[PDB]
Ligand binder design. Structure first.
Ligand SMILES: [Mg+2]
Ligand SMILES: [Mg+2]
Ligand SMILES: [Mg+2]
Ligand SMILES: [Mg+2]
Ligand SMILES: [Mg+2]
Lengths: 132, 109, 202, 192, 76
RNA sequence: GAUUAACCCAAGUCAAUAGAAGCCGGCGUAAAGAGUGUUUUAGAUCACCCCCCAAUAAAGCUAAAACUCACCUGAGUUGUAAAAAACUCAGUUGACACAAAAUAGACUACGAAAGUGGCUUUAACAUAUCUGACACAAUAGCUAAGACCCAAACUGGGAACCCCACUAUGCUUAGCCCUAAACCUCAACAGUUAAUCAACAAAACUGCUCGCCAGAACACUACGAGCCACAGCUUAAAACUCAAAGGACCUGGCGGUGCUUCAAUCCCUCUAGAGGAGCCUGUUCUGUAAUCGAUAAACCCCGAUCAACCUCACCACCUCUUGCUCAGCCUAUAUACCGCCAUCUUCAGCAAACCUGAUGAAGGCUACAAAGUAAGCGCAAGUACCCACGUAAAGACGUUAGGUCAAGGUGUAGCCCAUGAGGUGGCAAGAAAUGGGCUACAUUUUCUACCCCAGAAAAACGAUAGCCCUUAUGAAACUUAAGGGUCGAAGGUGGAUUUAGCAGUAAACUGAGAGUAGAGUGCUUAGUUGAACAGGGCCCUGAAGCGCGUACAAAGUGUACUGAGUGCACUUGGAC
C-alpha cells in the first residue's frame, strides 16, 4: 500500500484541501508545481540551490505564520525576484500581518541577495475540497 | 480401502439392477443406460456412477438430463431396498475412455 | 497485441477476389459485403501472392529457424530443394526408359510426400484415471510432429560434419521412399500405441 | 444504437443496464413496426453510423504526370513519387532498388503493391527513405509506394489494396521497456 | 396490490408518513390502512377508465373553481 | 501486599449465623398430562332442547411361497465386492404346514390403550346425555408340554462389521413378569375465534375437574416396604458438591468434503532457459581481534545508481573531555510510531449516513421486479507514450505484531572520563552448500572482409579464470579497471528438478545513461532482426458455484445375550 503523500480515508469527518486531496501521480495532470523556477530545466544549473532555497523559505514562512497559513506556499522565481504567495486565515490582526510581511520581505531579501515579495490572500477558513 | 471397494462393487450391482427395469422411470428405462463403474468419495460424501456415453450428442444430452433428474429417486430406491442403510448423493458422470480405443482401431484398420 | 479485437486477418488469394458475383452464394455475398466494413491487419512479411508460395515449406523454414536468422533458414531450405532435384536428375539420367517414368524429379512433390509418409497416425498422451494412452492425433499435430521429427533427426549429432542441406535431402528421400529413421520413429510410435491398446479404456 | 453512456448523457439521467436493455428493445420493436418517416426521424436520434484519399496528380517541368505520397513504419519514413508511366525502375535514395536492398525479402516488399495491382513495369518510382532498420525502411517505402499508386489505380483497385493491407498504416511499434522487467513483457527471472 | 398480489408498499409508507390515501380496493385487497377506500373492481378496463375519468374531472373542477374564486376575490 | 486519595456509617463499624421475605405459577421441547379404562365419597354446570371397513375371543378353512419326500435328468450347488468355509447336491414336475398373511392400502376405519390389514361362521364393540382409584398392557423374559418352514441374540467355522450352520426366542396351549421415544412427547369434558404472539412444534384461547413439578447431580441410586420366591420391577431418599443445569433460536469458524465451472493461465501442450563445466556475484557454515540490517511466496548483484584510505557504522592501538551543535550516542526497543514500502492486488470491493423481524440475536434478493437508497473511496473513468490498442500509471479497507530506529524525525530505555568524539593499521579468506548472472560446449559453428552473392578453420570449439608485463584513476594498484603476451584448463547440452513468455512478445545482438578519482558480467534505458503453440483437461495448486459434513467461538427407548456389538419391537427427538 502506498503511504506516500496521501490522506487515508477516515469516518468522513476529516476535511482536506486541494493539495492534500490530490496524490503525487496526478502531479502535472491535475495539480501544478508549488515552486516555479528554471533550475531543473534542461541545460540549466543550480537545481540544488533552488531546492535549498525552497525548503528554507517554506520552513521560514511556516514558523513565521503559526496557525495562520491556510494553504501551501507558492514560490515563483521571475528573473532574480522571488514571489511567495500565501493563503492566510483572517485570524491574525492586520497590523501584525503587515509587520510580519515587511519583516520577512526585508530579511529574506538581505539573506538571499534578491528582491522578495510576499502576497497574502485572506480567507475566513481553510478551503475544504472534500471530507474524508 | 477394502471397505470402499466393496461398497463400490455392491453399489454398481445395485444400480445396474435398478436400471434393468422401468422401476425408476419408463423414460429412463427406454434409454438403456449402461454403467461403466461406481466410485465412492473417500469421505463418503458422494457416489459417482460412471455411465458409458453414446456417439449421438443429442442422445447423450438427453440421457444426462434424465439421469440427473432421476438420481434422487434412485438414491431413495436404494435406501428403501436397504442395499445400503445410508447412501450419499448420487452423481452421474459421463465416461469417454473407450473413444480413444475405438478411434485408434479405426485408424489402425 | 496492439491490434484491437476488431481487426481481422487479411485474406491473400487473387482467385477469391476474381470469383464472379453470380457463382457467389447469399452467405458468401454477405461475407464479402461485411468484410468491406471490418478492420484488416497489415499483412505479415512472410506470405504474399506469389504463385511459388508454399505454406508448408514456409512453416518448415520457420521451425528450422534459430534465433531469427530467417535468411539462413531460407538458404538452407532452397539448398535442400536444389540438392533433392539434383539427385533425382542424376537418378533419372542413370535410369532406363521404363524406370524413368517411375522416377520423380519434383522437389516439392518429394518433400510433401515424404512429410506425409512421416506423419504419425496416432500419438500417445498421458491420461489420468497417469497412464500413457494411445490417443488419436489432430491433423495439425500430425503435421507438426512430422516436421519436428524430421528436423530433430537432421539435427542428431550422429551426422558428423555433414551439412544441413545434404542431411535433409537424404532424409527427405528416405522418407519419400518410406525408409529412414523418421519412418522408424513413426513405426515405433505405432508399435507403442499397439502395445498400450489395452490401456486405451483409461 | 447509441451506447448506454450516450443515452445517459442524452437523458442527463443515471440509468441501469436493464433500463438500457428495455429502452433498446422498445426501440427495436419500433423499427420492426413498419416505422415510417415520421417515426424513423425520431429513431435516428438514437442511431449511430459506423476511403483512402486520392492525392492530386501533379506534373513535372517536362509535363510528365506523377503522384507523391509518404508513409512511416517503426522509425522509418519514406517519400515516394510514382510516375503515371514508367519502365518499372525504382530508384531509392538515388540508388537502384536491388542494390539498396540487398535482401530479397525487402525486394518482395517493394514489389508487393505493384504486383497486387498488376502494374509492375508500368511505373517509375523515386523513393527517399530515412531512419530505422532495413525492414522498417522496406515497410515505409512499401506504404508510400502503395499510397502514391492509389492516385493512378482505379477506385476499386484502391479499395482492394486497402482490404489487403497495403494502404493501412501499421500500428505495430516497439513497446517501451518497463522498469523492473528486462523487456516490454520479459519479467526478470523469478527469484525464489 | 403489487404484481405479486401483496399490498403495495406505498400504502404502508403513506400510512407511516401520514399522507392520506384514496384507494380502489378490490375484494382481495386490504383496506385497513387506506384512508378513503372505494370498494370496486380494479381489473375491468371499463372500471379503471371510469375511475380515471372521475378523478380527472374532480381534479379539473377543483382547480378551475379555485382559480375562479381567487379571481373573484382579487377583482373586488 | 504497601502508599495516596476517596466513599458509607459513626461511638460504633460489619465478618459469621438465624430470621423477616413463603402457594391463585406451570406441565409438547426446559420438572411436570402419570401406558390405558372403570368406581365410591364427592365435585362441576357443560345435564333440560339430543350399517360396514383392520376391535376382541373361539372354531373351521388356504391362495402364493417354503421345507421334506418321490421320480426324471445334470455334476457341481451354495456363497460376494472377491473369495473362502460348507453340502453333494442342483433343475423340472408332483405331493405337501400347527409358519407368515402380496395386491386392495394413493384407503385412514375399529379399539380405552397396547394393537388390529387372508377367508367363513358364531358371540360382540359399556354409559350418564360431566370429571373422578379392580381389568388390560407391544417387543423382550420365565415356567410345563407341543410345533419348528423361515428368521436369529449366543456359539463355532471361514477372511465386531461380511459368509456358512445352528440354539434360545419369534408360534399353540396353560400360567406368570408389567416395563417402552407405551409419543399426536399436546390429560378428560364443554365452549369460542373475540381480540395473535417468548422461539420452535400441532393456530390461540376460555371455563371446569383430576394427576403431576418446585434448580442440577448425587439418583430409573441406598435404606425400608410391596410384588417376588432371590435377580429383578414399583415406590424413593439423605448427606456431601455447584451456580449453575436445561429448552428454542441467530451468526462466525472447520474438512484430511466430492460434482460442475474455472485459471503465459493449475497440469499437458510451443519457445527460450536455470541446475551438469568455468567465471562474476549474493547468502549460510568454518575461519577471522575484525561489518549491521534483509531471511518461504514477500532474503539472497537486496539497503548499495555500488568498500584500496575515506566510504564505515567493525576490530587493534592510541588520543580528547562543555566536546561542530544551548553537546552527543549507527546503542536496545519496527512487539510505540511518523516517514516508505512488500503480499494478495495477475482483486473489487470498502463504505459512512439513512430507511423489516408483531423493534431478539438478526435481515434487506426476484427486471413481466417483491425495501432498499447509498454520499465518499477504489476498480472504473481520466492522463503519458504512438490510436480508440497495449503498456505505463493507479490499485480502496484489511492480511502477515512483515521489514525498515543504520535515510531522517520520534515515544520509550540506557551511557555522559564514554554505549560520545578524533587519528594510524587490518581480514573482507574457503572444508561445503546454495541463489542469481555471464561465457561456453560449436558446424545455424570458428575467422577475416563486408554488413548478408567469398576464402580459410573444423577435436579444433572453449577463461572476462591463473601467471608476467604495461597503461588509466588515484597520495597509495596484490588491491580497481583497461591493453598485450602467456597459458588452452573443465565441458561436449547436462540429476534431483525447474524459470519466463501470448507478438514487435520470447530469443539474439548492439549502443547509451546513473553513480566514482577509478571501479559491475549489476541496474536503467534506446534500437535492430524477430518467430512457435494458443487446443485439451483438473490428479497437483489455487478461485468460484452446486453443495455436503465437521465442529468449537444415523440417533434413542425398552428388553436379553455376549464383551461395545448384536437380537426383537418401538420413536424421529435424522436423510432420500
Ligand atoms: Mg382485482
Ligand atoms: Mg368416569
Ligand atoms: Mg388411571
Ligand atoms: Mg406384556
Ligand atoms: Mg428354535
Amino acid at each position: 500500500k502506498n503511504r506516500a503523500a496521501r490522506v487515508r480515508v477516515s469516518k468522513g469527518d476529516k476535511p482536506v484541501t486541494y493539495e492534500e486531496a490530490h496524490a503525487p501521480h496526478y502531479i502535472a495532470h491535475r495539480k501544478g508545481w508549488l515552486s516555479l523556477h528554471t533550475g531543473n530545466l534542461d541545460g540549466e544549473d543550480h537545481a540544488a540551490e533552488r531546492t535549498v532555497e525552497d525548503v528554507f523559505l517554506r520552513k521560514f514562512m511556516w514558523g513565521t505564520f503559526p496557525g495562520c497559513l491556510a494553504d501551501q506556499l507558492v514560490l515563483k522565481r521571475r528573473g532574480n525576484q522571488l514571489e511567495i504567495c500565501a493563503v492566510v486565515l483572517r485570524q491574525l490582526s492586520p497590523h501584525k500581518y503587515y509587520f510580519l510581511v515587511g519583516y520577512s520581505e526585508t530579511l529574506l531579501s538581505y539573506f538571499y541577495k534578491c528582491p522578495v515579495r510576499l502576497h497574502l490572500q485572506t480567507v475566513p477558513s481553510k478551503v475544504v475540497y472534500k471530507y474524508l | 480401502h477394502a471397505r470402499l471397494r466393496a461398497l463400490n462393487g455392491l453399489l454398481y450391482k445395485a444400480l445396474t439392477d435398478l436400471l434393468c427395469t422401468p422401476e425408476v422411470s419408463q423414460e429412463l428405462y427406454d434409454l438403456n443406460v449402461e454403467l461403466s463403474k461406481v466410485s465412492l468419495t473417500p469421505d463418503f460424501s458422494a457416489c459417482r456412477a460412471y455411465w458409458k456415453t453414446t456417439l449421438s450428442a443429442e442422445q447423450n444430452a438427453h440421457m444426462e438430463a434424465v439421469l440427473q433428474r432421476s438420481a434422487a429417486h434412485m438414491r431413495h430406491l436404494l435406501m428403501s431396498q436397504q442395499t445400503l442403510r445410508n447412501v450419499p448423493p448420487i452423481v452421474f458422470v459421463q465416461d469417454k475412455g473407450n473413444a480413444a480405443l475405438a478411434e485408434l482401431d479405426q485408424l489402425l484398420a | 497485441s496492439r491490434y484491437s479485437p476488431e481487426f481481422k486477418d487479411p485474406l491473400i488469394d487473387k482467385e477469391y477476389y476474381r470469383k464472379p458475383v453470380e457463382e457467389l452464394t447469399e452467405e458468401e455475398k454477405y461475407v464479402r459485403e461485411l468484410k468491406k466494413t471490418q478492420l484488416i491487419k497489415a499483412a505479415p512479411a512472410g506470405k504474399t501472392s506469389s504463385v511459388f508460395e508454399d505454406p508448408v515449406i514456409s512453416k518448415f523454414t520457420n521451425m528450422m529457424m534459430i534465433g531469427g536468422n530467417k535468411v539462413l533458414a531460407r538458404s538452407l531450405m532452397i539448398q535442400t530443394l536444389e540438392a533433392v532435384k539434383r539427385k533425382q536428375f542424376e537418378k533419372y539420367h542413370a535410369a532406363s526408359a521404363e524406370e524413368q517414368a517411375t522416377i520423380e524429379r519434383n522437389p516439392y512433390t518429394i518433400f510433401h510426400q515424404a512429410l506425409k509418409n512421416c506423419e504419425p497416425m496416432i500419438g500417445l498422451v498421458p491420461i489420468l484415471k497417469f497412464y500413457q494412452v494411445p490417443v488419436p492425433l489432430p491433423d495439425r499435430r500430425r503435421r507438426f510432429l512430422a516436421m519436428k521429427w524430421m528436423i530433430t533427426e537432421c539435427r542428431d549429432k550422429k551426422h558428423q560434419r555433414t551439412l544441413m542441406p545434404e542431411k535433409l535431402s537424404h532424409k527427405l528421400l528416405e522418407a519419400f521412399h518410406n525408409q529412414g529413421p523418421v519412418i522408424k520413429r513413426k513405426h515405433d510410435l505405432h508399435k507403442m500405441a499397439e502395445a498400450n491398446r489395452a490401456l486405451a479404456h483409461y | 444504437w447509441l451506447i448506454k453512456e450516450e443515452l445517459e448523457e442524452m437523458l442527463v439521467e443515471k440509468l441501469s443496464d436493464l433500463d438500457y436493455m428495455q429502452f433498446i428493445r422498445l426501440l427495436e420493436k419500433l423499427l420492426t413496426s413498419q416505422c415510417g418517416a415520421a417515426e424513423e426521424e425520431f429513431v435516428q436520434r438514437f442511431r449511430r453510423s459506423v476511403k483512402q484519399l486520392i492525392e492530386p496528380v501533379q506534373y513535372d517541368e517536362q509535363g510528365m504526370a506523377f503522384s507523391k505520397s509518404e508513409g512511416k513504419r517503426k522509425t522509418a519514413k519514406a517519400e515516394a513519387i510514382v510516375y503515371k508511366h514508367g519502365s518499372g525502375r525504382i530508384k531509392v535514395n538515388g540508388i537502384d532498388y536491388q542494390l539498396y536492398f540487398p535482401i530479397t525479402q525487402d525486394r518482395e516488399q517493394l514489389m508487393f503493391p505493384f504486383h497486387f495491382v498488376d502494374r509492375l513495369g508500368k511505373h517509375d518510382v523515386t523513393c527517399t527513405v530515412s531512419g530505422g532498420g532495413r525492414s522498417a525502411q522496406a515497410g515505409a517505402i512499401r506504404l508510400a509506394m502503395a499510397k502514391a499508386l492509389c492516385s493512378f489505380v482505379t477506385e476499386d483497385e484502391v479499395e482492394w489494396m486497402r482490404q489487403a493491407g497495403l494502404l493501412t498504416t501499421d500500428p505495430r511499434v516497439r513497446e517501451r521497456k518497463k522498469p523492473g522487467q528486462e523487456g516490454a513483457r520479459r519479467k526478470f527471472t523469478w527469484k525464489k | 396490490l403489487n404484481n405479486i398480489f401483496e399490498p403495495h408498499v406505498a400504502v404502508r409508507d403513506a400510512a407511516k408518513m401520514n399522507i392520506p390515501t384514496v384507494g380502489i380496493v378490490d375484494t382481495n385487497c386490504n383496506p385497513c390502512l387506506i384512508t378513503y377506500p372505494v370498494p370496486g373492481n380494479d381489473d375491468s378496463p371499463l372500471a379503471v377508465h371510469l375511475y380515471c375519468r372521475l378523478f380527472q374531472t374532480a381534479i379539473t373542477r377543483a382547480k378551475e373553481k379555485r382559480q375562479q374564486v381567487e379571481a373573484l376575490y382579487r377583482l373586488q
